Every structure is written in structure tokens, then in C-alpha cells.
Design a binder for these strands. Sequence first.
RNA 1: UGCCUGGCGGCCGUAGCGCGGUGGUCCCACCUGACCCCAUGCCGAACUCAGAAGUGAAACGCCGUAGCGCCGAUGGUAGUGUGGGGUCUCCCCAUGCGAGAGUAGGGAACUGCCAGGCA
RNA 2: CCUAAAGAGUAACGGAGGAGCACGAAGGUUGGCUAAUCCUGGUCGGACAUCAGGAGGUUAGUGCAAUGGCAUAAGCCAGCUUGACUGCGAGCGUGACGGCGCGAGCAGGUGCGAAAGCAGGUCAUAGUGAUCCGGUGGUUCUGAAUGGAAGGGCCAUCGC
Lengths: 78, 116, 177, 135, 51
Amino acid sequence: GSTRNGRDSEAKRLGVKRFGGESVLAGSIIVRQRGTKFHAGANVGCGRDHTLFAKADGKVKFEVKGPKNRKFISIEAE
Amino acid sequence: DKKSARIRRATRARRKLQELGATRLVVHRTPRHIYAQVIAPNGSEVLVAASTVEKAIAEQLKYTGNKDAAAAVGKAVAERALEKGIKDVSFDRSGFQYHGRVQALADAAREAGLQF
Amino acid sequence: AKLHDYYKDEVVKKLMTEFNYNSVMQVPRVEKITLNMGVGEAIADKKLLDNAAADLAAISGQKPLITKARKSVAGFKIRQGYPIGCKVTLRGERMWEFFERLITIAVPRIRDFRGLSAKSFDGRGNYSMGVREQIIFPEIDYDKVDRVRGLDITITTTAKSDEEGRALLAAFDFPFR
Amino acid sequence: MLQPKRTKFRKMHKGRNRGLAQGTDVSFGSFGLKAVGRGRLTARQIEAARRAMTRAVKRQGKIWIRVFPDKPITEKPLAVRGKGKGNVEYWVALIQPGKVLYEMDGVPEELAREAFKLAAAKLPIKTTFVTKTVM
Amino acid sequence: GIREKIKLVSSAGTGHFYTTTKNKRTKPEKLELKKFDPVVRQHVIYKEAKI
RNA sequence: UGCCUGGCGGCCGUAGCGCGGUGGUCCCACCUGACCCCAUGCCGAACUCAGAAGUGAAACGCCGUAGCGCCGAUGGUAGUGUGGGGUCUCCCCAUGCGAGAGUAGGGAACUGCCAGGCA
RNA sequence: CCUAAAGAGUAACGGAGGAGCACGAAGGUUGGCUAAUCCUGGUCGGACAUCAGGAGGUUAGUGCAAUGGCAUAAGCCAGCUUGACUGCGAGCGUGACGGCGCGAGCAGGUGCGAAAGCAGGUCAUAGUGAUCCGGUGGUUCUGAAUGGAAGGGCCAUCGC
Ligand SMILES: [K+]
Ligand SMILES: [K+]
Ligand SMILES: [Mg+2]
Ligand SMILES: [Mg+2]
Ligand SMILES: [Mg+2]
Ligand SMILES: [Mg+2]
Ligand SMILES: [Mg+2]
Ligand SMILES: [Mg+2]
Ligand SMILES: [Mg+2]
Ligand SMILES: [Mg+2]
Ligand SMILES: [Mg+2]
Ligand SMILES: [Mg+2]
């Protein structure tokens, strides 16, 4: 016999690149993600692939806001 | 419900203005009255305000909930804003169509000298 | 006009005593009367619905909305976005004017009429009925129609129970059996 | 022979069988057969033990089977060497210490003990007779 | 692989073109879009032509 | 100063549904018209405008009530880092970390800015 | 997608599925809107068509697998449109490399919006192929004595 499986795709190296309290330059990618597991907070942008990036220098801060308990990432200007 | 449906309409723009960090000119409109507030970027600090519930403005008017009243409140809020010295604001229609009374208020505020 | 003044100046007081309401706003009001021509045979020939719409236009005196299919159904051979009917909503003046022509003129002219049913209620006091022929109304003529077509009528009311709904309609002398 | 009517997947990782059981109380009947050992019970073993148990009570009272064989086991044919996971041959329930396997009601304890003794001889796992507690 | 490549040519007569694809069966009519012509540095009408 | 109402934030179900009671001077809501500004893939329902006869019914707000949702200890248990051990498919011991579920119990929110009415 | 051991990565002729496109709107923007399913009543009409109300609360939808997302909707509808722009790009992710990806902001010119603003294609992740040789258009480059031209370069693009 044989197998009909045997396929996979390359790993995409998603996930958090800069954790809480880390100092980042503007432009720095904070998280790579499929869809917005995290949402952009203050001084953070969301790219077309839902990458969150710093729009300003400062420290990364994770926070849960709203009734749904959504995870936001923001940059505390420092 | 109507109010909840309007809060929904207002959220996108409000969240956006919060992100930009703009001084808002928030308008509220009822069948009988129309209100106006210049709220600071932080969002928990009213700088100036005006309304047809205020007797200073209401005494001069025929009816409080019409275009002509809105025009008056628009002039009122703008003058008080320029007194403190604000000028640059962003209009927040707060879920109401930019039309009729809301438009009238906004037009009057521009003509008065607010920059939007 | 006729039934509107008839409601305000008579029917209000009757129901104020009957059910013993406190406020006048607690009294039931006829919110809207909705028509419906569920033309499901227009999938082959669309002209059937166009002619049906023209008939419904004359009856109500208002432009009909062409309703679409909500989902695809294999049993009836329909796909989503196919026109399979047309409704009309009536509020204010055109509501009463139609309600006038319904009760007095149209209902008696039904072929082999033996009173309308009084069991047709949903639970929240909203009546329904099934008109068999469209020619019962004065606007439509017997000779001019190409094919006979029935239609549905639904009378939405600001009611809570069925007894309050039938009591409201009974005040307008609605043919019951 | 007990077996899921359908499954999302045909084949399952071997996995492991650590921990103590859930469902350690006599919940339905008055008397239970409880696993003291750890292992796998095949559908055939569950059936063989059921039959012995049922016959012993002469189809009097009621018997619950608390365990269900929902784990598919594959095997490779003879004289095969790789070339993909084997075919599903049978089904098992994973048993941990404390699992109540069977319950019984509407018989004397004396008869229940006998029936469960006959059932236990069909099972690869060490068992113990247990009774319903008030709390 | 049905959509054919086309070029949109500038109406400014610069010879500047954009390329895109087009389903020629479904949409036989010629594509026509105002696009930025960098040679004249103006938004001008671009019209479809053969690749 | 206090009470009530509106608007904008802070705080995310101990803040939600239900059940019982309660408010119309102002405010808010429904409500009254619609030729118009504007609007319906039909409809002044909504949107919108011009109004203020009626109404606190619905909605909205406020007060009570564990009836739910929900929150939730303590202890124990599961798991587990390091070291050691056994009867080693799985466990135990020393030490550190320690759930989930459940139990007692709770729960009928809290707070700044501006404006208006009332005493 | 799982194996994958709660950062990334991670093998087997391990366990399961998909791609080799589509779309000038299915892109942009402004304004608006909110699902499935069931219950009750109703011409033809039936288990299921369309109408009304209630419960429900996204159990729907998303151009195509699966996963992660989506109500401020990323879902649905309409108006006007071509930003599916040109030159660039602080900074960052990911690769042995060739490469691949995210990107605020700057200049020019544009669309939508009263305006704040948003727009360098599409909810995101597949839809692909180096170099050489050659073709087409452009070009303030080169042009074997000189002027030209051929040929070459550069920019855009195509083919097997
Ligand atoms: K579009
Ligand atoms: K559009
Ligand atoms: Mg993967
Ligand atoms: Mg494991
Ligand atoms: Mg504890
Ligand atoms: Mg706990
Ligand atoms: Mg990992
Ligand atoms: Mg790990
Ligand atoms: Mg390795
Ligand atoms: Mg799209
Ligand atoms: Mg020469
Ligand atoms: Mg020469």
C-alpha cells in the first residue's frame, strides 16, 4: 500500500516579536498574526496582514479592554 | 431601539477621533432641543458648550428644535470656543446624518470662525 | 380618513372601558396592513410577476416591492436572489383607505362567501387572511385579467393578546363567523 | 460490539494512559465493578463480560456499561514491512484505576457479587466489587 | 488560466503603459481608467490595447 | 450644598436577564403633521423636516428582591521544575510551583467633566 | 491543520485536506444595514418559496481548503469613483543565499467625504519559475576614422 498524505506548508514564523516592556523603534513589528488575536492600541498600527507595528518609539504594553475582553497592544511613549 | 442603533453609527468615527487625538465638537439632537460640546482630546474634559436648554439662548428663539435654533447654538459654541482660543476642532455628528439641523449647527460654527 | 376619525372618536372610549386601561396610549392601534402575492410560478416566466405587480399596484394604489428568495431551495427549484413574490406595506392614510375598501366592498364580493374566520391569530394580536381572487376589489376588472391570482393580507397591531386584537377589529365591524 | 457510529477521524495516535479515572462512583445502580488496574478494554472483552454478567442474573435487574470503546487501534498485516499507518482492526476503552466499568441494580448483593465475579474473569484488568455510597 | 494580459496605453501620447489582465469572454468591452502618467505627471485616460 | 435629567469619558457581567414597585414642572421618549429640505430597491416604519393637543402605556432611568446568568474562597486533588528511588507501558520520596472542577459564600455595581431643572 | 513537548523552529513511504485561480468589481470611499434556526398565523403553497410577529443572539456570512479573524464589522445594500497611482521610505520581520514580507512618513498627482480623514488592490495566509537567448514600446546613454545607422545599455513589458 501507499499513503495519500505527506504534505505540509512552510512554517510562517508568526507570534509575538516584542513582549511587554520591551523598547521598540517606530516601524518595529510587535506581533505577526493571522487575523487580529491582538488589536492595535495607542501608537500601534495594523498592517494589511494584521501585523501590529509601532508607530512611535516607546515601550510595548499589553492590555485587555472592553466587554469582550479584547487584547490590545499599545506603545507607551517613553 | 433607536438610541442604541445611533451609538453604533457613532462608534467608528469616535474611535477614529480618539486615535487621532483630536478636539471634538460633539453634537446631540432631540426633537425639541439641540446641544453642543467641545470636548478635549482625553475625552473627560468639556472646554465649552451650548444648547437650547440654556435660557440665554432659548429666550431669543421661536422654537428650540429647528434649523434656526441650531444655527444659533452653532454661533454660540463657536464664539465661546474662540474666546478660550481653540480654533481647530473635528466635528462629531454623533450618529446623526450631517443634514438639516446638524448641518445648520456645523455651518454656523464654521462661519463663526471654527476651523473644520 | 373615514375609519381614522371613527377610531379616535369612538373606538378609543369603547376599549378604555372594556379592558379597563389607565392611559390612552395603552389602547391598541392598527400599526400597518401588509399585502403579499407569493407568485412562485414566475421562475419560468417573469412576466407573470410583472402583471401580478401591476394588479397589486392598482389594488393598494402604491408601488409594490419585488421580494427576493432568502436562500436556495432544491424542492421548489429556486436559487438565492430570484424574484418570487411582491409585498406592499400600508401606513397612515392609504392604510385606512384600503381598510375601508376591504371591509365594506371587497369582502362581500368573495365568491361563495360565508364569513371570515376568527381563529386566524398568531398570539400577539395580529390578524391574517387569504383572499382567493383579486377581482373582488373594484379597481380590477373581470374581463381585463389574463389569469386569476389570490393574495394574502396581514394586519399588524400594537396588541399583546388575541382577545385584544379581535376586540379592536370587531369595533370596525370586521366580518366574523 | 460497541463502536462509535461515526468519527471525525479514522485513526488516532497511540497516546499514553496516565492518571486516575473519572467516574469512580456507582452513579446509576446499586453495585459496581471498578477497575483497580490500568489498561485497555477491547469491545470484545466488554461484550464477553456483559454476556456472562447478564446470564448470571438471568436477565433480572438492570445493567449499565459505563465504559465505551471509542479509541481505534490499527494493525499492520502479516509479512508487511512505514508505507503509512495500519488499518483499524478493533476498538478499545482506556481504563485507569478507579473507573467503574459496569453497574447493576435490582438484584441481591450476593447475586451481584457472583455475576461480577464471572464478568471479571473475562477482563484483562484487575477489578473490585463496589457499592453505592450516600455521599 | 483564461484571463489574458492587456496593456492600458496613455492617451497623453507618452508611450507609457500599465499592464493588467482581463476576462475577455465575460467583459468584451474595452477597459478605460484614468491613471497617473509619470511622463507628463498627470492623471490621464488610459485605454486598452494588445499586449 | 443635596436630589433628579441629558451629554462625553473613566470602569467591563459582583456592572447581565427576570420579578415587584415607581417617575413626566424641566428633561427624555413616544407622540402631532408632512406641501417642502431630505427619505423608502414598497411604506414619513426608519431617515428627515415643521410642530407641542395628548401620554408616561411601550422605551428609557431609579428603588427593592437570590430566581437565574455570573463571581468565588479555604482545604484537598491533578499536573509539574530540580534531585533521588521503585515492582519502571506507570508511579513513589525530598524540595519548590500548584490548577481545573466542586464546596462555603457572594452578587441586584462603582467613578470624573460639563450643562439644565428643582428645593 | 495536527504530530510539535503553552515563544520561534522541528522528522518519518506519520494523520487529514487544499492550490497551479478569480474579480474593473468581488478594488477605493461615503452613507446606511445586521445573521442562522425554530415556534405561531396566513390564497394556490406541500417538510421546505414569499408575508407578519415572537424567541434566539451570529449556532449565519466571508469568491474557492483549513486555521486564525471579523459587529467600529473584515458580513449585507446603495451613491460617487480608479489609490489595482508614480517617485521614495525611518524602522522591522523572515531566510545559508538567491530572495520573500510588514511599514509610519515624505514629494507629485488623484478619488470619495461637509469635514476629521481614508485609499499604493481584495479579512489574512496558496494561485508559481532564477539565469541565458530572444521579441515589443520608450530613452537628455553608447555609437569602433567622422556624420549617421546597425548593434549594445537603461526603463517598461512579453514569449516558449
Ligand atoms: K466598492
Ligand atoms: K461601493
Ligand atoms: Mg502550518
Ligand atoms: Mg502526552
Ligand atoms: Mg487551592
Ligand atoms: Mg479554582
Ligand atoms: Mg510552537
Ligand atoms: Mg515549547
Ligand atoms: Mg533539529
Ligand atoms: Mg472583498
Ligand atoms: Mg562611427
Ligand atoms: Mg567604421
